[PDB]
Amino acid sequence: RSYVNNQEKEVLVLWGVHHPSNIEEQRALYRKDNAYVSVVSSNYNRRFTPEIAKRPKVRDQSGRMNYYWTLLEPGDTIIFEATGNLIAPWYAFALSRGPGSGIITSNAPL
Amino acid sequence: RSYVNNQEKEVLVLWGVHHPSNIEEQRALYRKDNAYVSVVSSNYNRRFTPEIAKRPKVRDQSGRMNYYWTLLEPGDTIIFEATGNLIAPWYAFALSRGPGSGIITSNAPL
Amino acid sequence: EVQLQESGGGLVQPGESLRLSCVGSGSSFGESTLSYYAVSWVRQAPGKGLEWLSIINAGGGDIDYADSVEGRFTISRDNSKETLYLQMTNLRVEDTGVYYCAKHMSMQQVVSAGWERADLVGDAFDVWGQGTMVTVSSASTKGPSVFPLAPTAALGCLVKDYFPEPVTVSWNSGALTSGVHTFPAVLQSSGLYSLSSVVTVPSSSLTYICNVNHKPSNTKVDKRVEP
Amino acid sequence: DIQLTQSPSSLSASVGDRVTLTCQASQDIRKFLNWYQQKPGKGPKLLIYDASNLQRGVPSRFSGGGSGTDFTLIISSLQPEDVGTYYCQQYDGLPFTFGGGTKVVIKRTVAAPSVFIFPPSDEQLKSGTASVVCLLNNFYPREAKVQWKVDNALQSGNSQESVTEQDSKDSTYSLSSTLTLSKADYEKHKVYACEVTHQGLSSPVTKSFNRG
């Protein structure tokens, strides 16, 4: 799947790669023992391979989902190619970055 | 291929790994579906595997060449081992680093 | 692999022109079609050896020619059609022969990868075409005369008067593919070619026919051979 | 230019013999030399590329050696399918040039020609021309003394014979003879004989026919 950034702004794309806990979970969900995800743009390209191991549970899940992101520049195209395990983007964000700020952690009302 | 740094100085070595855009480009150029590059010294060792995907064109190229570098110390040896996709070094640089400076970006004449 | 098929040759008057085409098909390593390689034209005169004429590189550059054909002949290639061309001009009688299309071994470009070879290698010809014949003679063309040779045993076909070569013999569409002997043609005293073709058959007789094909005159004969 | 000289012009050998073909060059062409076989009527097929490399699918018996100006192709166990013409060719410089070729000829046991005689047709003698043909089949050696007896009278000055190429399986030949004479001449005599002498026959075998 390709997406051409026609927003005249940066687009923030996020996605995920799912790592099952055993090979049977892999086969049931994706029907391949060996999957891979590729995300590639004009200045981004990573390949993501699922890595299956016994892990301690977190929120009662032994599996894991690794989350990733990139800022697709105006005019550039991002391409997703997957054999399995891809947590695909559905909604993304068109933004223009400001001069540069930070996070405040508080309970004071607005 | 090995190179023994006999310069009594640091040698800067650079190289590249070529990532085709489809498997047929891989087979035509290197005759292996699965290549790898290894560069190893006394304190450097990386393995580079080519990763083949559909990418947007840049300078009318869908392929990519990733560029790498290391400072081989005086007396040390660097070893290149490749099954394909290696952009091999041809010329390298013998240098002694100075106290430490920076880059000026200008149009003022020298 | 890659296959090559010359075409567009035959009989032409002296001082005239003729354009041979070389069509490529199939692919070698890495889905490499003919546009990945450099091609040459090579001709062979009747009874002699091989003469190289011209070379062209994959992208259409580095043309060169043999001195004997320089200025008259011109090489080119429509890579979109995977086709080579040879535009012959001012044809002389000695230009008669079988013109071949021959691919060079080494890969010269891989366009989708953005890879070219800096030099033009022009190394071994690993693929040739079947050839197309060019007959340069102001003599007119004439159709073949075919007569039977009725009857181990033997039955034949006598193609008596025609010009110029070549013809195509095939008994019962390749039914008799064993024991055949299409004989090399001779040049009769009149000036037109003659040729016989035979096959061995035992005591058993089944009907046997010979399929004759003479391209330059739209001639196709399925002559019988009954006793 | 560059001239390639091939020796010999032709070699006769037997099946299983090992043969050496020579190709010498007029100047140092390094190893930019290749060899092609060409069976008659067919296109050339590549055998050896760059002096010494066997091309894919070429039988392992083919070897090639040399460098500089002295190159050789070596056929290890000669087979009847090897009959044909072998050319060496260079690409060290333009124009690309070929050797003169070296024709391989096969020696085998003696073969007996099955002899046959053929008259014209109801359409040929009607056209106003006669063509009688003698067609010895698959024989070895090559030379066959073909003479024509018309009511026991030798023909001289009206003949034409064509030999086929050496067969790539049994290494035999084939020879047909053409006697071209008008249809007015055909009405005179009655019997025509094809007396041929060949080593494969203990005595001349004359196959003939009477007029009609």
Short mmCIF file of N, CA and C in Angstrom, two decimals, chain A residues 15-86:
data_model
loop_
_atom_site.label_atom_id
_atom_site.label_comp_id
_atom_site.label_asym_id
_atom_site.label_seq_id
_atom_site.Cartn_x
_atom_site.Cartn_y
_atom_site.Cartn_z
N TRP A 15 2.57 3.00 13.01
CA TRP A 15 2.23 1.63 12.67
C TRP A 15 2.82 0.71 13.74
N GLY A 16 2.58 -0.58 13.57
CA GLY A 16 3.04 -1.54 14.55
C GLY A 16 3.38 -2.86 13.90
N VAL A 17 4.22 -3.63 14.58
CA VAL A 17 4.59 -4.98 14.17
C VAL A 17 4.29 -5.91 15.34
N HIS A 18 3.52 -6.97 15.08
CA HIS A 18 3.08 -7.89 16.13
C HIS A 18 4.02 -9.08 16.24
N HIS A 19 4.51 -9.34 17.45
CA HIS A 19 5.40 -10.47 17.74
C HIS A 19 4.67 -11.49 18.59
N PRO A 20 4.17 -12.57 18.00
CA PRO A 20 3.52 -13.62 18.79
C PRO A 20 4.46 -14.22 19.83
N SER A 21 3.89 -15.06 20.69
CA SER A 21 4.67 -15.69 21.73
C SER A 21 5.10 -17.10 21.38
N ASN A 22 4.38 -17.77 20.48
CA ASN A 22 4.80 -19.08 20.00
C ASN A 22 4.49 -19.18 18.51
N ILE A 23 5.07 -20.21 17.88
CA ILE A 23 4.92 -20.34 16.43
C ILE A 23 3.49 -20.70 16.05
N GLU A 24 2.75 -21.35 16.95
CA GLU A 24 1.39 -21.71 16.60
C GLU A 24 0.50 -20.47 16.53
N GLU A 25 0.74 -19.49 17.41
CA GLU A 25 0.04 -18.22 17.28
C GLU A 25 0.36 -17.56 15.95
N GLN A 26 1.61 -17.66 15.51
CA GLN A 26 2.00 -17.07 14.23
C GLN A 26 1.23 -17.72 13.09
N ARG A 27 1.21 -19.05 13.06
CA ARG A 27 0.56 -19.77 11.98
C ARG A 27 -0.94 -19.53 11.97
N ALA A 28 -1.56 -19.43 13.15
CA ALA A 28 -3.01 -19.27 13.18
C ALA A 28 -3.42 -17.89 12.66
N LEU A 29 -2.64 -16.86 12.99
CA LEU A 29 -3.00 -15.49 12.63
C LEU A 29 -2.55 -15.09 11.23
N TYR A 30 -1.42 -15.61 10.74
CA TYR A 30 -0.88 -15.14 9.47
C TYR A 30 -0.51 -16.22 8.47
N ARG A 31 -0.51 -17.50 8.85
CA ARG A 31 -0.26 -18.64 7.94
C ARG A 31 1.12 -18.60 7.29
N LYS A 32 2.11 -18.01 7.95
CA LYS A 32 3.50 -18.06 7.50
C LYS A 32 4.39 -18.23 8.72
N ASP A 33 5.39 -19.11 8.63
CA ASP A 33 6.33 -19.18 9.73
C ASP A 33 7.27 -17.98 9.73
N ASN A 34 7.46 -17.34 8.58
CA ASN A 34 8.46 -16.28 8.43
C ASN A 34 7.84 -15.11 7.66
N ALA A 35 7.43 -14.08 8.40
CA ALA A 35 6.87 -12.86 7.84
C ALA A 35 7.90 -11.74 7.95
N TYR A 36 7.54 -10.58 7.41
CA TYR A 36 8.37 -9.38 7.49
C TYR A 36 7.53 -8.18 7.12
N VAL A 37 7.88 -7.02 7.68
CA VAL A 37 7.25 -5.76 7.33
C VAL A 37 8.32 -4.83 6.78
N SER A 38 7.98 -4.10 5.72
CA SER A 38 8.84 -3.06 5.19
C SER A 38 8.06 -1.76 5.12
N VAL A 39 8.66 -0.69 5.63
CA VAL A 39 8.13 0.66 5.49
C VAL A 39 9.23 1.51 4.89
N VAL A 40 8.94 2.17 3.76
CA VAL A 40 9.96 2.85 2.98
C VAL A 40 9.39 4.13 2.39
N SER A 41 10.17 5.21 2.47
CA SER A 41 9.82 6.50 1.88
C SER A 41 11.04 7.01 1.13
N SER A 42 11.11 8.33 0.94
CA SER A 42 12.28 8.90 0.29
C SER A 42 13.49 8.96 1.21
N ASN A 43 13.26 9.06 2.53
CA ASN A 43 14.34 9.18 3.50
C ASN A 43 14.09 8.30 4.72
N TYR A 44 13.23 7.30 4.59
CA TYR A 44 13.00 6.32 5.64
C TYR A 44 12.93 4.95 4.98
N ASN A 45 13.67 3.98 5.52
CA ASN A 45 13.36 2.59 5.20
C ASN A 45 13.87 1.67 6.30
N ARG A 46 12.94 0.97 6.94
CA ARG A 46 13.26 -0.08 7.90
C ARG A 46 12.54 -1.36 7.50
N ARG A 47 13.19 -2.48 7.76
CA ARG A 47 12.56 -3.78 7.68
C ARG A 47 12.35 -4.32 9.08
N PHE A 48 11.16 -4.86 9.33
CA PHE A 48 10.77 -5.37 10.64
C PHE A 48 10.49 -6.86 10.52
N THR A 49 11.23 -7.65 11.27
CA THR A 49 11.03 -9.09 11.30
C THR A 49 10.46 -9.49 12.64
N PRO A 50 9.43 -10.33 12.67
CA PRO A 50 8.87 -10.73 13.96
C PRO A 50 9.81 -11.70 14.65
N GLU A 51 9.89 -11.57 15.97
CA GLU A 51 10.78 -12.36 16.79
C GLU A 51 9.95 -12.99 17.90
N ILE A 52 9.87 -14.31 17.88
CA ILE A 52 8.90 -15.07 18.66
C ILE A 52 9.63 -15.75 19.81
N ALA A 53 9.23 -15.42 21.04
CA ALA A 53 9.85 -16.02 22.22
C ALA A 53 8.83 -16.07 23.35
N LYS A 54 9.15 -16.88 24.36
CA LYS A 54 8.38 -16.85 25.60
C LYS A 54 8.75 -15.59 26.38
N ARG A 55 7.74 -14.80 26.73
CA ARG A 55 7.92 -13.54 27.42
C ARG A 55 7.02 -13.52 28.65
N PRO A 56 7.35 -12.72 29.65
CA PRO A 56 6.42 -12.52 30.76
C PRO A 56 5.22 -11.72 30.29
N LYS A 57 4.08 -11.99 30.92
CA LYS A 57 2.85 -11.31 30.54
C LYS A 57 2.90 -9.85 30.98
N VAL A 58 2.32 -8.98 30.15
CA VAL A 58 2.08 -7.59 30.50
C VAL A 58 0.68 -7.23 30.02
N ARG A 59 -0.15 -6.72 30.93
CA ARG A 59 -1.58 -6.60 30.68
C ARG A 59 -2.10 -7.93 30.14
N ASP A 60 -1.68 -8.99 30.82
CA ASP A 60 -2.08 -10.37 30.55
C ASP A 60 -1.75 -10.81 29.12
N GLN A 61 -0.76 -10.18 28.49
CA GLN A 61 -0.34 -10.55 27.14
C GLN A 61 1.12 -10.95 27.15
N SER A 62 1.40 -12.15 26.65
CA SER A 62 2.78 -12.57 26.43
C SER A 62 3.31 -12.03 25.11
N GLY A 63 2.42 -11.77 24.16
CA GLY A 63 2.83 -11.18 22.91
C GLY A 63 3.21 -9.73 23.12
N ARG A 64 3.69 -9.12 22.04
CA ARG A 64 4.12 -7.73 22.06
C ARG A 64 3.76 -7.09 20.73
N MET A 65 3.56 -5.78 20.75
CA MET A 65 3.38 -4.97 19.56
C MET A 65 4.35 -3.80 19.67
N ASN A 66 5.34 -3.75 18.78
CA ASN A 66 6.27 -2.63 18.71
C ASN A 66 5.70 -1.54 17.82
N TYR A 67 5.75 -0.30 18.31
CA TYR A 67 5.14 0.84 17.64
C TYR A 67 6.23 1.72 17.05
N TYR A 68 5.98 2.23 15.85
CA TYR A 68 6.95 3.00 15.09
C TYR A 68 6.26 4.21 14.46
N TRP A 69 7.07 5.16 13.99
CA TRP A 69 6.52 6.39 13.43
C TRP A 69 7.54 7.09 12.54
N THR A 70 7.04 7.89 11.61
CA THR A 70 7.88 8.75 10.78
C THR A 70 7.07 9.95 10.32
N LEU A 71 7.79 11.02 9.96
CA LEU A 71 7.16 12.25 9.47
C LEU A 71 7.34 12.31 7.96
N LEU A 72 6.34 11.83 7.23
CA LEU A 72 6.38 11.88 5.77
C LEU A 72 6.33 13.34 5.30
N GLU A 73 7.34 13.77 4.56
CA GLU A 73 7.44 15.16 4.13
C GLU A 73 6.44 15.47 3.01
N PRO A 74 6.05 16.73 2.87
CA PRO A 74 5.06 17.10 1.84
C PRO A 74 5.53 16.73 0.44
N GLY A 75 4.70 15.94 -0.24
CA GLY A 75 5.03 15.43 -1.55
C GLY A 75 5.59 14.03 -1.55
N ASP A 76 6.16 13.59 -0.44
CA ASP A 76 6.78 12.28 -0.40
C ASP A 76 5.72 11.19 -0.26
N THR A 77 6.12 9.98 -0.61
CA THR A 77 5.26 8.81 -0.57
C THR A 77 5.84 7.79 0.38
N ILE A 78 4.98 7.17 1.18
CA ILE A 78 5.38 6.08 2.07
C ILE A 78 4.74 4.80 1.55
N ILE A 79 5.48 3.69 1.62
CA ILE A 79 5.01 2.42 1.07
C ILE A 79 5.13 1.34 2.14
N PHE A 80 4.02 0.66 2.41
CA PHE A 80 3.95 -0.45 3.35
C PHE A 80 3.90 -1.77 2.57
N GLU A 81 4.82 -2.68 2.88
CA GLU A 81 4.81 -4.02 2.30
C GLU A 81 4.96 -5.02 3.43
N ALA A 82 4.06 -6.00 3.49
CA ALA A 82 4.04 -6.94 4.60
C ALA A 82 3.66 -8.33 4.13
N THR A 83 4.29 -9.33 4.74
CA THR A 83 3.93 -10.73 4.61
C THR A 83 3.10 -11.21 5.80
N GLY A 84 3.14 -10.47 6.90
CA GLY A 84 2.34 -10.75 8.07
C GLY A 84 2.71 -9.77 9.16
N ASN A 85 2.02 -9.90 10.29
CA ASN A 85 2.41 -9.23 11.52
C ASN A 85 2.32 -7.70 11.44
N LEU A 86 1.77 -7.13 10.37
CA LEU A 86 1.70 -5.68 10.25
C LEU A 86 0.48 -5.15 10.98
#
